[PDB]
Structure 1
Amino acid sequence: FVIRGDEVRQIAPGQTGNIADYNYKLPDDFTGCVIAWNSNKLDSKVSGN
């Protein structure tokens, strides 16, 4: 999936955030881990995506 900046912090288990709780909500007991990187090059529109 694709989100903004602060919500990658919001993703972390236990932490609560509107996007986090209303969309993905990783469980408390988690055995796995995430990847993230900047995507401004291929996911930005001058008029707006």
Structure 2
Amino acid sequence: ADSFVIRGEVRQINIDYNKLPDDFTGCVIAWNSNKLDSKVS
């Protein structure tokens, strides 16, 4: 289980900027960071 936050790049995982493509075998569990890891923005 990896732990990263991207911009939105949500169509892909720009991100050659640190190689984890769609045909890599796995599941994507994802949600918005604007409710917990945020501010006004």
TM-score band, normalised by the shorter chain?
A: 0.5 to 0.7
* Deviation readout 1:1-49 (Å, 9 max, x if unpaired): 01121x12122xxxxxx23x121x12575221211111211111348xx
Structure of greater Rg: 1
Count, aligned residues: 38
The aligned counterpart of 1:33 is 27
2:10 aligns with one of 8, 13, 23: 8
What TM-score comes out, normalization by structure 1 length?
0.50
Moved beyond 6 Å, runs of 4+: none
In 2, Cα distance between equivalents of 1:22 and 1:44 = 23
In 2, Cα distance between equivalents of 1:42 and 1:35 = 16
What TM-score comes out, normalization by structure 2 length?
0.54
**Root mean square deviation of aligned Cα:** 2.5
The percent identity for this pair of structures is 100
